[PDB]
Amino acid sequence: ADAQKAADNKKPVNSWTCEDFLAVDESFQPTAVGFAEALNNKDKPEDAVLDVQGIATVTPAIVQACTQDKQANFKDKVKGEWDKIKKDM
Amino acid sequence: ADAQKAADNKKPVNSWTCEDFLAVDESFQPTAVGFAEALNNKDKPEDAVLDVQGIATVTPAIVQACTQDKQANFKDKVKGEWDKIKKDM
């Protein structure tokens, strides 16, 4: 859809900085991390059962972390926050 | 994530019911439509920028509709509200 963020397909989740994560409401920021990872772990929704606890644990990570660095690169924020959650051990 | 929706015989969004759409929090209710209709329109997130305005339009439809008809299959209910949104015109 076009009446959001900037435009349909012009600043996508593999082409723009973390400032574009703060354009989205709290209602759909968990969906913003959702789409970038959902499409990364299956091609079609025949294997979609949702990843609720993952999304709900990771929501307060990218939400803050994209305000910590608006100029941070695409996808590296979801990777870096998942690393802070698991890989930090 | 381990603490959520562990599968039995594979019961994805194409089998999963609206009664359990009420069990996930309001913060992540749009994430479920963002894991069905998100995948089916493409393959990968390389061109995605979220369907935010579409998801925000379609959320209050499915949120009420999953209480109206708890026993519906979720993939049929997202189609049902998309029809009532678009096809009704």
Swiss-Prot record, chains A, B:
Its main location: periplasm. Keywords: Chaperone, Disulfide bond, Periplasm, Signal. GO terms for cellular component: outer membrane-bounded periplasmic space. GO terms for biological process: cellular stress response to acidic pH. It is found in: Periplasm. The keyword Cell membrane does not apply. It comes from the Bacteria. The keyword NAD does not apply. Disulfide bonds join C18-C66. Belongs to the HdeA family. Required for optimal acid stress protection. Exhibits a chaperone-like activity only at low pH by suppressing non-specifically the aggregation of denaturated periplasmic proteins. This is Acid stress chaperone HdeA. The chain holds residues 22 to 110 of 110 of the full protein.
